[model samples]
Target: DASTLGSFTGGQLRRLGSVAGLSRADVETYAQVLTDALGPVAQRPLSLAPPTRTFLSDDHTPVEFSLSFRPGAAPAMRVLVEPGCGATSLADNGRAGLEAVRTMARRWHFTTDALDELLDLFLPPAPQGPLALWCALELRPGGVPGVKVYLNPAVGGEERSAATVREALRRLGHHQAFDSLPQGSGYPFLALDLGNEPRAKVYLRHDNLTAGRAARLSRTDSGLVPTAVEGFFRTAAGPGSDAGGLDGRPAQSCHSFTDPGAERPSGFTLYIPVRDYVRHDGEALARASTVLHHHGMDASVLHRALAALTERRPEDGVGLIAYLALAGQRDQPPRVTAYLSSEAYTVRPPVVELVPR
Candidate 1:
């Protein structure tokens, strides 16, 4: 029965493609047909604030409504009515609303007579007494700002349910709300199989913290500088390898890579795994290096400086396993490469145990 039904992003029609294995084009047609039948659909942005000001009234009152459609077979196909309030009210509204919405949907040619038969099989044994309606609202696009609602049969929190549903509908596209509330938020609202159960939950985030930090770093000139190779060794090598012993100069050997017109600073390379090369592009790397150099950093002393920085503040170091590859031969271009290990750290190297692709 589940195999014959499908879910979509926009609504029932949009989800039809996923269920029936149809192309996007076909789904679009289905959506168009549904829209024509249902009349104009309206969407409002979700908000944290409650929609109605009836705080003093019963919290279990209905505040919103939703329609669900199953595509095939009598027992398999049915309509679900989500009342804005708790279960008792929802059951009543669900039955009444089902008929109305189903008729409307049928006129649109979205369902056949099978929908009626499905309802008969599914809607029986109706709530004999008052039952609280409890369901979780799955927000679109996921991780947006919102709250979930719950309705317990014995509890009187109808206002809470109404507020939750209203806010969820209002914020529809503006934020992403997943069906399952995050573990941090709390627990599942209630375990009801409205129709299809979501396999993966969704979340919402609007700010790009990393991007903002990068932009701020770019405008500052506090990190760029030029220094000799000997300076680099002084900082990178053991404590004994100081300036007095190494006779290193800014211009030791000249090579094509060493800029003929430009004064030679130092020559050294640090290897970072391809995976650990943060900021990705060459421009970002150059920008970051310039920032580092501007803050009294001699180009030669970079290796040692970086090593010292990593040692002192390991948190700043990228977690990439890599080996250093020194450059050689002035006539040849400077060469450096980085390798990334795919597997987790172990006593044995992953390459040695690979089965070969």
Candidate 2:
């Protein structure tokens, strides 16, 4: 269906209305705009990363959404887009993709200057490697619509990516913060928060990372919630594995929230691609529910979200949902957010399933 890719997302937005504190009118407005924005891009197939010529049914969905749900608080959602569909380099693809949203970005006051500076800061002047720029629009009812841009820090290679990130941190006046980061084999991604004061954020990844290892890398003087952090991975990664190690369990992303001149990050966000570790969507849902229940939050919200996305039974398919992020800030327990794929292309065909007898 070349008709629309945003429809699913639009429906989800409409259904999640007011839950995120958005009014009916606001929901309708956003839904319409999203539809309009995705009309052209949704026409062709899209890949997760550029330079990969082969396209799968799942690869066609360029946009993914993340919903952050906390008890008694209005939910927050993030819309992520990987713009270009062709087999070009990330820099070239990112540039063209950014152009498609120029007007919308202008209307939202999301300046691309910081994004350009970030490219220059972390990437070579003329980068032709396997890198990417991911754009996200942060939405909450009363909150200012903001943008976060994610870029590959590895301009040259993994080693260079790490060094470039360290240098970028040093230049941003966060030299000490860099010291606190893990020296694992996984390369990190850099994000610029353009919704407010443009600040650099790092999503450091770790393979075979234990709760103790995560705590060691994440522990700050005031913000890291050790128990909740451990619990999050314990639930998401399941028992014995207790960390991101094995085949299904890939690298986990440790996103640090910091300010200039800070000795270490002020807070941390843990992202576990639960979809990777699960046999199917049902398993992923169970894991999410367990985490929500453990944290004393309502699990019904999960049902509502899945209902909005698809009518198919969860156990029948896989990858309808993707990563699950846990944000651990001061005092409060870690906030759980579910990242869902719109399945703009073929949902069932793209994912495996156990046929119901």
Candidate 3:
């Protein structure tokens, strides 16, 4: 989006939505609102890309992921992902884990008949054992919400046949009878135990949240760290070739894994006076120049970072919480007490606090 943020015309804005992976409804709603505000989109983004997203652990570096399948005896998953300064880049095991899940997306066929039940790709990974990559897929067709517990490589496949797997899901939680499972199409699951078996725990009803939530919550704790920063720098303090930033900041980008690596400081968070957040008008574009100049951080980099981040997030009236913001909070005021959002998108706006440490 930054590529054309301030420079893109109306025509580009209309189409950029789909490319950015926004839902069709979201695109239709926002484009109408954006078009009404600026005729030619006087201020648009510059460094944005498709299949790429921002990471707090990497300041403003671009992160991309792609997966490829190699079919043979033992399927090897070759996934390509870019790493950033302070972020957890994909590792060897990470690649292998992804490949284990590959059998679900591939090795299957879709025929469009409702009786032809299928697997949901939204399942989060639940590691069971070596080669036993357990994940879930929702199978709620008639308001009877349930999960399809698909697994790969659960050895002793014959041990968990139609009766065994059915009992597993049934005993796990609320579930319809085995007869409810859509016809014969539910079998041949592509299981991963001996013989590349395909078996799954189908249509288990959940009494609590998704299977993962209870586990996630049991491990959850709360409190703010109360951190402090001296200054802000939108660009990585690394050395290498990169796209030209607004000022003279580095443009280093590693498009492919083969790109040369460079030294850069770990990703960091920045803060600026809230006044700058309200200056989004045409001439005043609120480019965060005030925050940059105040911190002596150098201006060349902030524009690109600021423009790209704001374009992706919904505009909170006071402003959105972005690691990309060095010069930036939520409701309860004209005042946003703190930056409390962790996930890119939150169900309810996160609570804000301004306690000094």
Highest lDDT against the true fold, candidate = 2
Task: Give the winner by TM-score.
Answer: 2
Worst 10 residues of 1 by lDDT: 248-257
What is the Å distance of residue 15 in model 3 from its true position? 12
Tens-place lDDT per residue, model 2, 1-357, is: 433345555666676554455777777666665555454554343222222431222444656777887766666776776654353465656565556456557677766665664556544556544445556767655434566666777766676777777776666667656677666666557777775435667777676767766556566543546777777777776643543453464546554545557656666777777777777788889999888887767777676777677778888877866877777665665678888777655444466567892
Task: Compose the digit string of candidate 3's lDDT tens values, residues 202-266.
Answer: 32211212212211211001111112121222221111112232222111100001111211111
Off by over 4 Å in 2: 8-21, 32-39, 45-60, 87-89, 100-105, 110-113, 122-131, 142-144, 220-222, 239-244, 349-357
The TM-score of candidate 1 is: 0.19
lDDT (CA) for every model shown? 0.25, 0.64, 0.25
Please state every model's RMSD to the true fold in angstroms: 28.9, 4.4, 22.3
Off by over 4 Å in 3: 1-267, 271-287, 295-357
Q: Estimate each model's TM-score.
A: 0.19, 0.82, 0.18
Among all windows of ten consecutive residues in candidate 2, which has the lowest summed lDDT?
A: 48-57
Estimate candidate 1's alpha-carbon lDDT, on a 0 to 1 scale.
0.25
Q: List the residue pairs that clash in candidate 2.
A: none
**In angstroms, how far off is 143's CA in candidate 1?**
31
Cα shift from native, residue 174, model 1 (Å): 49
